[PDB]
């Protein structure tokens, strides 16, 4: 009783362990393309049926003008993070993991990378070293009349990480393929005029309006895990790891009122890792200056940590060396996941001092949870 | 396990009965009322024989005093005629206990199409809608009085071969209580912009539409003559020791894209699930919805289908579709049963959340009286 | 001598109800793709392998734009039912069970189901059930710059039914894999012109020429029973129902003249549950007015059931509940299904009262056969 | 010792025969595509898994262009073989075996047909055979103004031959695909302008420049062997025919000075069959004027064969009954293959007259080797 | 299986007889006459030895005595100079009986290029057409005459290595019987717009073009001076109880995009398969065609392919192609049903024109039985 699940656990490291020792790591381009976002913007990718696969590292370039005649238009907060509005990924047995936007994907590949994801560091290097492949790129304003070329990278997980395989998927059926889902920005989406909403947007200003892509292209890698091991059972593979979904989704929620606790549960079931709230408050994004304060709690009124706006985001810059753009707010609970089972019902909790029109939280979750 | 002798001679004894009864379908009640005075009735079944259920006709005027604004029929209608049912047997225990709108679904669904409809054909014999079995005007303009009809079917008894659940009442002279609860004048119309799942009529002539009366029949559906043998009554231990419920909830927290999981609990023998997806007042056509499934912990989803797809199953059933925002799920051959509570959930992933979401869930279920 | 026969029967009946009894039935999606039919429109699809395969839910939406600048067109009696051009399936020894068109495949479906498939009837209900999720829609007509959205539904059975499994495929076997191969329509298939057939087309019109897809996606669910029954000899299976083939094929035959019987024989060996006739009188599909009468009938010159065009209809309102389309002549022999060797040869014939020039009877049948 | 190798292979000739008299031929078609070049150019097409692959005949059509004012263009000495750039292949196991330029694998079907692959031979005969088809088929020139329509084919193997299965495909493995990978020409490879290497592709001249795709359009074709024998111990099949790989590959090597030996070395393990060496001269194809000679030598200051270019050429007319395009030479050794353990390093050799600027030597080659 | 043993012995007979008897190819007949007083002869073959085969060399002289108007060849052109031709045995059993162009193409297939054709090269010594072993003018313009050579091998053995359907003739003085029908003034000539399957030239001045004469001679082939041994002659009794016959057949009633399906008989062990479509007098390059296949019934296609890479196929078995003639090589794997009908040759028509259908060519093996 229970020492089944003490050995299952077991047997479950031991074997990750051989997998990362025997199989050789692959990264792969599985397809490329180039279009025109005003004839389409969705694209179903169909990878590799390989081993186990770890994740995607997904390129995106584009380029943009403005072809105002007067007036320029300068990036969101979010910019080019905003390329890919929505990623869906669907294993061989059509279960979904990520789903999610492409903002809430790229703060976490930054959360878990530690500083912003893929990223040049200023230093005083008389050598040569700092931006010089714009591997993450977009210009600060597009000029009327101009033309701006941007770069964009997000890394779609399935694997938790290098080492954890935690949420890989076995793709070695073959007729039943996975699917990687995106939908881009496209001319409704990533250019707000002054006063709009910019949160999706990758563009904002007064010659918004007559901005427009010239074109889009993308190419899909794949890393996954070749020459898997094999024993006196066959395959050695963790099971546990393999059964199990590491996934990111986001949320919105409304209805917060100033000085009163707006409270986001936590579903059960899930293993939840990482919290991001993002306050668009009516599309206005302050830095701190709209809340009380930030919590999370086990409901029975108890607090772990109610913190004012400022001592949350130093908490944050532990994590990310950085501030999350303004009105990104973020939880680590990679150590001890928030789990309702083990702590009863949890929620995140905003208290707003200042509600705008149309203001609501948007929440991105990292978490674990069985396939079964 | 004596549990085979137990089942074979249950159902030996149900066919036995069944045979050899005659079944009987009495008026026990019939009340008219204004629903400003009251709207909350307590009907009392007769205490004869082995009762399978009772058939509810409503019937009400309903006046649009509005100057100048019509308003027209809601997506469920008459069918909130009755708010809400409770029933308790003889024994003080509960069955159905749910929604009128969830009765009438479920009513539906045991039948394969739209209860007690009249299907259309082009048979030139004047067969049609001759008798207005559930009937109510689209719409009632200012200053006018619409006429409605509706009919609900509250099952002790599973079907009319299963009793399964059936009520012995021939016994203790102790009372049955058949709870009815009807629309009044603050749930059966909805202004223009307010939520219209609870009501019969919305439009902007709303504020000024009152019942005229409302009327009810209540008919007893039993078995009457019941079979005697050598100990005595010849009955099914276990229909009558089995109740057959139907029952409602509401769940809320569901945000974009993330899995929102209604956990069913143990015990019960789930035959059938209803999710009426209340998007802070708007129902609509699957758009709202990336998929809808049923999940065993451990063992991933039996089946997630898109909204479409979940909805052709549907079709299969009652031969069309259930209103805009209502998702229906047969599980009757093989009934939900975890054993565990929550080792199966019913899921939505909703694409767009508004404000004051929520799931209303609707179920039919068979447990032991234990 | 033929006891072991009725004893076979006996243990794989008995082993049937086990399996349907002790199996968990389960559907899941296995692809989704979207594409243009310029570029491509025949699809090999791979199924997973697992437990006892019953069936695939196709699912097929389009968008279909009529360019032509004055003239409209609209569906052809077929329409939808002609978004999958045909259907073949082979099982994981590779051998083929259904191979037919779409328009068989569905008036199957609705035989089956006994109703038009997956309708939504009309009812005097005030509560508003009705077609409120488009499950199988299309626009009866597209004007000229307009573009009509469709969405189809085909059922590709395995087994015969949910009870019956007879037909079912055990995919257990790795590395043999099963395959749903799909011929959609396209842009060359899908719009006749006026005057020309429109038996494989969707649209028919004076603006034909200029209509195309913007686009056909399709999604497979497959159907099975998983958690398969284990006994003391192993896996307990109904052998029998496992390796029997439940097929629809179809046919063309021509040579018809004016009163006399065009006869279509059975083949040998195979039970045929259901024969379809659709008289494509060259083009014309007509409301029985081209036919004297049609019979079933066991050679020795003996019909058993020659009707006029109007009685035969009747017999299959009794089945479905309402005509199929202008042309389309169903025949049920399900409970005593044709079988050469208990009745010798038989045929399908229809005695044309007017004959076209090119015209021709294309069969549609349903059938039990052993593998072996 | 070493006897149990005599054994094993007469089991497996044994049992290859045995699959070949029992099992039946199937080539069945598995996927088609029309795409425009400028939008994609890459595909990943999944086989079905039925039975023991034997290889892929893989179908080509294209339309070109040339929108040039007034210049036209000319097929390159390669032509349509270059509508297909490279091909690769992996099997379940997610084994690499072909992965070549389409030119190489063109150059090696015709040098396993005995003549230029799936042409037209011309005769003296009255009755009309001739090109009637046009099987393989590319217009001479394309004028200024004019659309060109091509037809390609190439044959991708995996077994040797129809009667030798070395190298073949076992198919079984439920939820493990094989992969074949297609990298095919775009307007950016297809068209060279006067004076660029025309190398890669298919025309070249003063209009280049405005060529383009108006469509490429491929089907591939599987070809494998259905209804496997068995035998008392299950699947009767050639195990060493199975772990064999029969793989095509090319490389390119630079350096080669006038009068020098230019080596290049065959590496071990592998057992080639045949080699084609291509002197890109800096762009500049040449009928041998460029070659002193050529040769084959196992070190050891021992050469095999070392021929001046015509007589090089004499002997590759024995074996295609023509000559291959100028600056490709071919080298059979079927029948006592390359094998540097067998016979110690060895090496191709090419002593060049007159070296250009950027000349290097893109060999092919043809191999047998272990999986293990 | 007593089999194993008469094929192993059948197969070592045929050995000793190959190495031990002599080749021989003789002039049996020689005719010449005027197609307008008679076409169709009955050629007496030399009973003697075992009997291959025969060639059969035609030469024509055409007449185009039309006033101002040429004429063509057709696609089949001096194929068709021998209409049809039918072998009886000793024992009164027919063999091949199939049409001249049937009989061409299978000569052609089994060849493996164009029967007795001279391939073009770049060779400066002056190898070439010098003989014009099989040879018509393209067009014979009016008033003109024309030279015509055709020859067609009639087989009876499958080849010279495989005895299989020779005939044993020093056995009784029953006669053999090779009936030839040859073209004549009503077949030979097409008008524009007339059907051109069965003639020879086609064109505006057609109705005027006419025979001056054909002549024919019949070349015999046979093995002499059997081996004898202790029981008598040494015999492959499997190869010579065997037919192998070529035979010809034709089926209408094709609609556009529907399949149609030509049953293979059971019995019969088909080598190859030919078929024609005669798109109502219109011969089209694949382009009325969707896909050709052969199927098996609940089993699907072994080879559904569209009309491009079915003719990639046939090039490789002919090195050309393969207008409207279809070839399918099952030499291998011979079509062998046992039930009729369990396979058949499916053509999915994408245009059918009025009067159209597929004229049928077979190459098989049959037992006596």
Redesign the interface.
């Known amino acids: 009783a229970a020492l089944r699940n003490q050995q299952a656990m077991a047997a479950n490291l031991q074997a990750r362990q051989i997998v990362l020792q025997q199989s050789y790591p692959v990264i792969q381009?599985?397809?490329?393309?180039?279009?025109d976002p005003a004839n389409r913007s969705?694209f179903?990718v169909?990878p590799?049926?390989?081993?186990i696969v770890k994740g995607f590292l997904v390129k995106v370039t584009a380029a943009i003008t403005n072809n105002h005649a007067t007036e320029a238009v300068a990036l969101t907060d979010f910019g080019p993070a905003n390329l890919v509005q929505?990623v869906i990924y669907?294993d061989?047995?059509?279960?979904?993991h990520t789903?999610?936007s492409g903002w809430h994907l790229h703060f976490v590949n930054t959360a878990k990378q530690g500083a912003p994801f893929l990223s040049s560091m200023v230093t005083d290097s008389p050598i040569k070293y700092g931006d010089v492949m714009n591997v993450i790129d977009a210009p600060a304003t597009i000029a009327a009349g101009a033309t701006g070329e941007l770069t964009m990278y997000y890394w779609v997980p399935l694997a938790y990480s290098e080492t954890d395989l935690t949420g890989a998927v076995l793709?070695?059926?073959?007729?039943?393929?996975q699917?990687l889902k995106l939908e881009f920005a496209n001319n409704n989406t990533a250019f707000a005029a002054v006063g709009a909403n910019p949160l999706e947007a990758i563009y904002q200003g007064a010659g918004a309006a007559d901005c427009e892509f010239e074109e889009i292209s993308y190419t899909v890698y794949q890393s996954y895990l070749?020459q898997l091991p094999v024993g006196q059972n066959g395959y050695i593979l963790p099971l546990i790891d393999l059964?199990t979904l590491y996934n990111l989704?986001?949320?919105?929620?409304?209805?917060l009122t100033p000085n009163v606790d707006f409270v986001?549960?936590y579903?059960?079931?899930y293993r939840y890792l990482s919290t991001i709230a993002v306050f668009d408050n009516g599309g206005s994004f302050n830095a701190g200056t709209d809340i009380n304060y930030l919590s999370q709690r086990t409901a029975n009124f108890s607090d772990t940590r109610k913190l004012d706006p400022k001592t949350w985001a130093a908490q944050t810059r532990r994590r990310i060396a950085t501030d999350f753009p303004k009105g990104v707010y973020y939880c680590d609970n990679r150590d001890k996941p928030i789990y309702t089972l083990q702590y009863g019902n949890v929620g995140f909790v905003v208290n707003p001092k200042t509600v705008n029109q149309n203001a609501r939280l948007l929440?991105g979750?990292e978490y674990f949870t069985?396939?079964?």
Chains 1, 3, 4 share one sequence.
């Open positions: 381009q599985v397809e490329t393309q180039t279009f969705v179903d169909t590799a049926n390989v081993g929505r669907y061989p047995d059509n279960q979904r789903e999610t793709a070695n059926v073959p007729q039943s393929k699917r070749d059964s989704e986001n949320s919105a929620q409304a209805g986001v549960q579903a059960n079931l929440m979750y069985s396939r079964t």
